[PDB]
């Protein structure tokens, strides 16, 4: 399914 993009702004 989805990857981190889902926008992981706190990475």
């Amino acid at each position: 399914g989805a990857t981190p993009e889902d926008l992981n702004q706190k990475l």
Epitope: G1, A2, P4, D6, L7, N8, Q9, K10, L11
Partner: antibody, heavy 112, light 108 residues
Framework: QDQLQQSGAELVRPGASVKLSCKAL????????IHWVKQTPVHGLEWIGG????????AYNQKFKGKATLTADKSSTTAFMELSSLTSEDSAVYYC?????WGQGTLVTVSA | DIKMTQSPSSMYTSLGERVTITCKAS??????LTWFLQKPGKSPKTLIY???RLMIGVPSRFSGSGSGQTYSLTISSLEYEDMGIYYC?????????FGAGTKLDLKR
């Protein structure tokens, strides 16, 4: 790819505290942020905050800063949300979400 | 706060009909939008993510489009199991914000 499992229904007394848990299963816990969202018939859906179990970074909605504490345990792939000083307005369904997957929600009833 | 204006807010539809729901954002959200649906008493189920990716398990009847500020969700032929409330989620910036929801009901 799998799922979020939330703790059961909580009945608390005004002024007390609750800690809700969200277990992440079937996906790498450290690559995705877990976000907590509040739902009530009056206000609809609202974002509380969120945490990156990876980097440990947290972000909060201004309205919940000082009320809610977000934490995550990497050994149990469990994100946690603490709510202090409860009043009846805190009475809601609470949801953890990965933005795509959603936990099933825990009902918190604040009552005497 | 990015504002999400979801319309219409309630729609009276027939089974088998094509439905379109929209969300305008107060600023450009770079396609970071989800589309989910909630049935009475049940938790939210995401349908679409990053504006137009179907979610594993979702009929191809659902399709999402848009870029920048205007996003749409089309349901090609409406089924009984699609009844419920539809929301959009912007996750471009914090705080995350939701649309007011779109309530679907069968006309009669």
């Amino acid at each position: 790819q799998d799922q979020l499992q939330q703790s059961g229904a909580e009945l608390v007394r005004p002024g007390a505290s609750v800690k809700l848990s969200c277990k992440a299963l079937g996906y790498i816990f450290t690559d995705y942020e877990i976000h907590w969202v509040k739902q009530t018939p009056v206000h609809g859906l609202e974002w509380i905050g969120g945490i990156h179990p990876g980097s440990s970074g947290t972000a909060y909605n201004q309205k919940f800063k000082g009320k809610a504490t977000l934490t995550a345990d990497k050994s149990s792939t469990t994100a946690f949300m603490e709510l202090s000083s409860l009043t009846s307005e805190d009475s809601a369904v609470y949801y953890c979400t990965r933005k795509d997957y959603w936990g099933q929600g825990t009902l918190v009833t604040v009552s005497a | 706060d990015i504002k999400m204006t979801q319309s219409p807010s309630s729609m009276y539809t027939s089974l088998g009909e094509r439905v379109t729901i929209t969300c305008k954002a107060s600023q450009d959200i770079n396609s970071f939008l989800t589309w989910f649906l909630q049935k009475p008493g049940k938790s939210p189920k995401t349908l679409i993510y990053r504006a137009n990716r179907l979610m594993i398990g979702v009929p191809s009847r659902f399709s999402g489009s848009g870029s920048g500020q205007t996003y749409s969700l089309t349901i090609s032929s409406l089924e009984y199991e699609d009844m419920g409330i539809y929301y959009c989620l912007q996750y471009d910036d914090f705080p995350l914000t939701f649309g007011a929801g779109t309530k679907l009901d069968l006309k009669r």
